[PDB]
Design a protein around this ligand. Sequence first.
Ligand SMILES: N#Cc1cccc(CN2CCC3=C(C2)C(=O)N(Cc2ccc(Cl)cc2)C2=NCCN23)c1
Ligand SMILES: N#Cc1cccc(CN2CCC3=C(C2)C(=O)N(Cc2ccc(Cl)cc2)C2=NCCN23)c1
Ligand SMILES: N#Cc1cccc(CN2CCC3=C(C2)C(=O)N(Cc2ccc(Cl)cc2)C2=NCCN23)c1
Ligand SMILES: N#Cc1cccc(CN2CCC3=C(C2)C(=O)N(Cc2ccc(Cl)cc2)C2=NCCN23)c1
Ligand SMILES: N#Cc1cccc(CN2CCC3=C(C2)C(=O)N(Cc2ccc(Cl)cc2)C2=NCCN23)c1
Ligand SMILES: N#Cc1cccc(CN2CCC3=C(C2)C(=O)N(Cc2ccc(Cl)cc2)C2=NCCN23)c1
Ligand SMILES: N#Cc1cccc(CN2CCC3=C(C2)C(=O)N(Cc2ccc(Cl)cc2)C2=NCCN23)c1
Ligand SMILES: N#Cc1cccc(CN2CCC3=C(C2)C(=O)N(Cc2ccc(Cl)cc2)C2=NCCN23)c1
Ligand SMILES: N#Cc1cccc(CN2CCC3=C(C2)C(=O)N(Cc2ccc(Cl)cc2)C2=NCCN23)c1
Lengths: 176, 175, 176, 171, 173, 177, 177, 174, 176
Amino acid sequence: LIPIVVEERAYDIYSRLLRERIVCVMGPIDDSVASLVIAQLLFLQSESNKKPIHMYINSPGGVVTAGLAIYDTMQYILNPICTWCVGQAASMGSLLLAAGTPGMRHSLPNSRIMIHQPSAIQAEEIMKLKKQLYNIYAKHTKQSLQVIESAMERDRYMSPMEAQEFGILDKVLVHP
Amino acid sequence: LIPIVVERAYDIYSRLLRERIVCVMGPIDDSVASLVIAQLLFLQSESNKKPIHMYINSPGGVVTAGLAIYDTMQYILNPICTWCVGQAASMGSLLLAAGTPGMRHSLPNSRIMIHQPSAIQAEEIMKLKKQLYNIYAKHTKQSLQVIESAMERDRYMSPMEAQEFGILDKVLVHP
Amino acid sequence: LIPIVVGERAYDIYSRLLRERIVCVMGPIDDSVASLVIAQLLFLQSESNKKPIHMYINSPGGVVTAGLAIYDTMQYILNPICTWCVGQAASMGSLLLAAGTPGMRHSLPNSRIMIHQPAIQAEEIMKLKKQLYNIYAKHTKQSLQVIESAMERDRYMSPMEAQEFGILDKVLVHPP
Amino acid sequence: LIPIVVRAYDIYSRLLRERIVCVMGPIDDSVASLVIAQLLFLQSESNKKPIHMYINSPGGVVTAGLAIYDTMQYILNPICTWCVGQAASMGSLLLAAGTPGMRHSLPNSRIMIHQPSAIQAEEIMKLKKQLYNIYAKHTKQSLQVIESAMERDRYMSPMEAQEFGILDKVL
Amino acid sequence: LIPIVVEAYDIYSRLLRERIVCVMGPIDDSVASLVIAQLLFLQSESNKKPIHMYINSPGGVVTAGLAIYDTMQYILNPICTWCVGQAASMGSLLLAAGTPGMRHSLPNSRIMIHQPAIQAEEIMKLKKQLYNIYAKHTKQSLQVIESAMERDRYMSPMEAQEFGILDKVLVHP
Amino acid sequence: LIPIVVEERAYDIYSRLLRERIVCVMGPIDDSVASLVIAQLLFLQSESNKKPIHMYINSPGGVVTAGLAIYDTMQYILNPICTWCVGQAASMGSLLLAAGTPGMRHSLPNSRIMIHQPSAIQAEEIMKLKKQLYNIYAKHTKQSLQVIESAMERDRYMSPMEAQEFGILDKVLVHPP
Amino acid sequence: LIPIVVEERAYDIYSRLLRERIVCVMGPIDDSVASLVIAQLLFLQSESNKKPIHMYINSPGGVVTAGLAIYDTMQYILNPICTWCVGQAASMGSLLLAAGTPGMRHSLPNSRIMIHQPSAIQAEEIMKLKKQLYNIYAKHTKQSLQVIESAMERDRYMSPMEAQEFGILDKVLVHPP
Amino acid sequence: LIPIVVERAYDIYSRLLRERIVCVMGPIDDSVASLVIAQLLFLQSESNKKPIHMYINSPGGVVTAGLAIYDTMQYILNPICTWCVGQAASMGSLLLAAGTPGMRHSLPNSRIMIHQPAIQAEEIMKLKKQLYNIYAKHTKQSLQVIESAMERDRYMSPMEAQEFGILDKVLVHP
Amino acid sequence: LIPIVVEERAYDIYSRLLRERIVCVMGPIDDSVASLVIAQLLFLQSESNKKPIHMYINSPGGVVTAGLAIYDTMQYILNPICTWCVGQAASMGSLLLAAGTPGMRHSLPNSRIMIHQPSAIQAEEIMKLKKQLYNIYAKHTKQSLQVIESAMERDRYMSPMEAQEFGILDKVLVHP
Ligand SMILES: N#Cc1cccc(CN2CCC3=C(C2)C(=O)N(Cc2ccc(Cl)cc2)C2=NCCN23)c1
Ligand SMILES: N#Cc1cccc(CN2CCC3=C(C2)C(=O)N(Cc2ccc(Cl)cc2)C2=NCCN23)c1
Ligand SMILES: N#Cc1cccc(CN2CCC3=C(C2)C(=O)N(Cc2ccc(Cl)cc2)C2=NCCN23)c1
Ligand SMILES: N#Cc1cccc(CN2CCC3=C(C2)C(=O)N(Cc2ccc(Cl)cc2)C2=NCCN23)c1
Ligand SMILES: N#Cc1cccc(CN2CCC3=C(C2)C(=O)N(Cc2ccc(Cl)cc2)C2=NCCN23)c1
Ligand SMILES: N#Cc1cccc(CN2CCC3=C(C2)C(=O)N(Cc2ccc(Cl)cc2)C2=NCCN23)c1
Ligand SMILES: N#Cc1cccc(CN2CCC3=C(C2)C(=O)N(Cc2ccc(Cl)cc2)C2=NCCN23)c1
Ligand SMILES: N#Cc1cccc(CN2CCC3=C(C2)C(=O)N(Cc2ccc(Cl)cc2)C2=NCCN23)c1
Ligand SMILES: N#Cc1cccc(CN2CCC3=C(C2)C(=O)N(Cc2ccc(Cl)cc2)C2=NCCN23)c1
């Protein structure tokens, strides 16, 4: 039941959010989510490839290759990407969260962050995908492999404060 | 089916938004939180001084979805008037009591519940309950001790007991 | 499929009903119906807080706390509210019907009215059931004990007994 | 789904511009509120010009049908009821409540006043007397003649239903 | 599921050997058919020895409960009805149809005579059957029975006993 | 579950009923209700060509062809059959009720009896079947076709006492003679 | 999804059909098929009391009362109506086919036409309805009752050419005249 | 599914009945209650002095189904030993507390709840009062203590429950 | 489709297993499983309370209070209890496995053992139950609390060899 706003043109509030260069990553990440997000990120680059992009994550995770789709598009565009976590970023959600422009990775105070991966393909393939997750997290947290994979074994959430200290985000904000 | 009102014409819900009114109706999940946060943010983009009104008629919902609203309420600058209609239970009463002080209201016949009624580990659930304990104590001026024994009783309060406990400031019959 | 009716503007018939300052409470009552009726009632009060609103009730009841949100918004707003019972008004429907302005509570001749009531602790259900007694007591101008007695009988009233009981003021057949 | 005719309407809206109100299929609360809407809307447009209720229905919720009956009886306009296909149970009630000399059916229609088979038992009998009464009113038959007929699980043809008092014209 | 006792029966076959007939939960044609069979068997074994009918039911199909009620009237034995838990709607009409003086409840039972695809005249007709049955066994007047069944509520064993539904309320022998 | 009773010998209560030459017609009658009922009419006749059988009927009706199968077995076998109506006998239930041995058809007092037929084949075939019911009911009630055809058009129930006056049964009994 | 076509003005293809005074009876006919078809017979008549309307029929039948509603609208309105059978017209479909203006009822070559009625109400009421279909078919085919009643008892389809010789239609066309 | 033991050959549940052991397992409905009440009537016909053993591992159930069991336990003359295993919650703990005084037992790890989780609001409140009074009776607590307790959405330990009046002993072994 | 064996009496093979004093704990543990197991363990004690009892665990876990029911009955009976793990013992399964008589806790070579708890009650209650699990495991593994709870956080299985070394079992056997 999505509301309309005027600005004189008239958009629904989500079209409006994308006009402010805000892309939502809200919920379980599947291919068509990934498709929406990728579409938006590439449209904002076309508008201005130096102007920043804010991406808002409230995601329990999802389909791993769909998330890497987003992640890869993040790495590709020319824009700074402020990532913001509200509610939670678990599994691929905090992967996207940890993959913002350094210095521009934010959570609100009561957010919950998980890098552990909640548990139809071959066994070695899953391990392959799981190393990919291990290196991406190592890249952006500036942590070691063995630290990352020990960490990813703890079935557990962090506070915005621990996640900052671990390298997943940069600033925990209450106010602007 | 949602009616149109009327010089251009919005559906009634779009028109509630022009009043700076954000409805939080029913159970709270992430996509409701997405809708509420967007409006809060947009309403602050419109003026960051002009108040915002949050009509809460909710039984609770996903804790982190509700926290994403609570946090966003705290983030924005505007005075936030919160309104309880029918009932605000579990996460929905956290929100109701998070409105800016002296600006939390109930219509007379509502019911208010801070009891949390009832896939993660038991150490994580408990971490989340602790976060609720602290929010509630922060906004009702009550001690954690008072907050926990109270949240332990499976009961509703009238808007008056609510106002006395520190969830509400006003109860009113009319403007 | 809702019909359209017709400077010159074009309305679906239900908006048109709201232009006439009519709000409908058709069928069972839940939070989303209540959101809709409160939205319409607060809007009508904003277009004129002295002009009457007409509220049409054909309803078998509903969620109590959702029904009370409607009742309280009736009592809040500034406008005279003339209620009309068509078809039936049982439980919360009859309470909305009985909570129009004194002397502007109507039924058409064949309506059936019920004040008998068809997960929460047992003490909260009695708390709530007592709020119902207090509201019916108020507007029907009947004693508490008489309300509690009446609400124990699993029966409907004629629009003429409910006139007689306190629930409505006039039974109309044709327009005055 | 639904075509568009030429200013442009959809056909069911174009019909309403013609002062025509369909009653089509089973009657429930939302049929009734849609029908009562149109009836009021039409009388607001003119209280002298007749309205046309096209009924093809096997009935429905008694209270929902009673709601439409009363709205008919409230509004001032002459009302021409039209039976098409069938008007059975509640449907036949409204058909019979068109204003006199204006109740029609088409030749091959079927008309039933037998009421085919959660509230208390006394409250069910109360509702049935209401229809007994409503029917006796508009057919000018007696209550003993209404209840007897209402017990025979059967249709009448338009001519049977004309002699009974349900309608006036068959074409 | 059902345990086996020696004396070799299932426990419910052994209740029947004790002349105990359970009427558990909702009445329908199947339940009624069962019950009636045991009632005729028991009489066939002896038309003088009582039969203990154990009732704990929210009611059921009217026609089916009436088949039971009729069977009860037919057979010669004194029938001791026992309410455990609850007897509502039809369940409490059988309770009332025990032999006078041997209608019992346990302390915490609940008793209800209020009643929760056929025609209106027929639903009223069956309701008058219930009216007259209840009036006969409570010795209460018709008009007292109908007021009663309209109040949607339960009676405690002692209000059920002051009304003529049962006779005795036992905490223990 | 079906209790077991002792006799020296163990029977489940329903088996021990058949021992009494009692046959139960309980519930909707389909082809396998009919099959099981016919199985025991034929059986009970082979235990005695002349000892009376008892049908306990509590039924709201059923498949017409499955009902007529039972009616026809009932007509075939040589046994006097006493019918008993308990709870109800509507539609084909009441036809099995009416078809007991003249003067052996009974109701308990509180039973409800209906002969109206409540609402894949062609149209001529349903009127074929309706007519067959007319003639069966006409036969045993001793009523005229005309009277059967309109009584059945009244969607209503008869008391055991009106059913006795119409012809469906012969005695309404409260206690054992 | 329904394409849009341009005319200056945009119509979805089905709307633009109605513009040609074409009305489609496609599929099972229930009360709301009938309602929408009647809506456009009445509409097209009000655009012209005498210009011919075209019913395209491809239907396997439907609710008899809903069919007879359409038949009756078709009889009411003053317009000459050309019927066209495409794919099939079985049961009430073929009755709407037969009821076009004499000599305006058509089939394309490969259509299949059935008048047999493939297999809640009482029995007298279904024979009531069957008889009404007998008289409608009798009327427009110009066949006797006796002939209609047995043709309809044959569970079978007719070619457009046999249907033309029976009376259901008048012309079987391959290309436009 | 259910095994046979030899002694003569019972299924293992039939053999527990021969020990005078009545099992109240899982949610209590009128059917559980039928089975339980049957067993208690029978076991008393065997002897009205020999103790009955009610093993309870139950989350709760229908209240009238529960009170039928309770009333049957009051009716019979036998000393009843109640034992709690896994848990006894809502109606279950009510049965646990209702065994013969000095004979109510829990295993060291059981959890006990007296908090309760179509009829009118005056019936529920009538039923709840009835739970209030059974409980008050059997824990020697007051009504006020009992009512406030049942309002806390919480389980107790077996020692807690022992201190409160719900049970007498807590045994790791015999 | 359970087979019968003769021994001359004739039992199904599972009745036969219980005659050899073998009780299976096979699969998800719910109240009626727990009831079966408890029944069997108490019947074997009645036969001989010094003769050992072998309990065979292939369980992914289950309802925690139902498992403690079994555990408590284990602690209660007088008999030695050899526990044997085949396939897997995860969550409450390895709790029962770790709760055998010391010296009599066995796995086959390819078994998989989990003490981590795969993830409708109050929050503090779940923590209470979870401390119970923490102490029981500490009791029988002779490990510390902090070691146990760190361990229970690793979403992960052990080999019969690691589980022995950790204190969950005593012997890993290939042959008799
Ligand atoms: N899925 C995926 C994926 C993710 C990251 C990078 C790429 C590579 N593509 C190659 C083609 C390509 C790219 C980048 C591109 O961004 N623009 C500019 C553009 C795109 C969208 C919008 Cl709305 C407006 C302007 C473009 N314009 C035409 C061809 N083209 C693909
Ligand atoms: N989920 C979440 C969450 C909740 C609270 C606070 C934040 C932090 N963000 C930072 C980025 C950011 C924020 C707040 C922001 O309010 N506007 C202004 C704005 C927003 C919507 C509309 Cl329609 C119009 C204007 C904005 N415009 C560009 C960058 N930007 C995120
Ligand atoms: N749910 C609930 C509920 C039910 C009854 C009473 C209230 C109290 N609120 C206080 C705030 C408040 C109220 C009433 C108010 O009526 N208008 C005027 C207005 C509202 C909507 C529209 Cl479409 C047009 C004009 C308003 N404009 C900004 C703030 N505001 C809430
Ligand atoms: N359900 C019901 C029911 C059935 C029959 C009679 C009534 C009584 N009401 C009184 C209020 C009332 C009525 C009739 C009324 O016809 N119009 C005129 C009107 C209505 C609809 C439209 Cl689209 C346009 C104009 C009106 N305009 C302001 C308030 N109002 C209610
Ligand atoms: N349904 C019904 C219904 C309900 C109440 C009363 C009756 C009347 N019937 C008549 C036939 C009849 C009756 C009573 C009868 O009790 N016994 C004795 C008997 C019955 C069952 C068993 Cl297991 C053992 C012995 C009997 N033996 C042969 C025929 N017969 C029928
Ligand atoms: N369906 C059907 C239906 C219904 C009624 C009548 C019939 C006709 N059949 C003819 C053959 C036939 C009949 C009757 C027959 O009764 N017995 C004797 C018998 C039958 C069953 C049992 Cl258990 C014991 C003894 C018999 N024994 C051998 C051949 N035979 C069929
Ligand atoms: N269902 C049915 C059914 C089927 C066939 C015939 C009839 C009888 N009615 C009588 C009233 C009536 C009729 C025919 C009529 O055709 N027009 C003209 C009209 C209709 C619709 C449209 Cl879109 C445009 C113009 C009309 N305009 C006002 C009253 N009126 C009913
Ligand atoms: N539900 C219920 C309920 C609960 C508690 C008390 C009662 C009252 N009845 C009275 C009749 C009665 C009772 C108790 C009784 O215990 N025995 C002895 C007996 C019972 C079962 C078995 Cl397996 C073996 C022997 C008995 N034998 C004949 C009459 N009779 C009913
Ligand atoms: N659930 C639970 C649970 C778990 C552990 C311990 C207990 C305590 N009970 C007390 C009563 C009790 C116990 C132990 C007992 O083992 N036997 C001996 C016995 C048991 C079963 C069988 Cl098949 C054969 C002999 C006994 N015989 C009669 C009373 N009785 C309960």
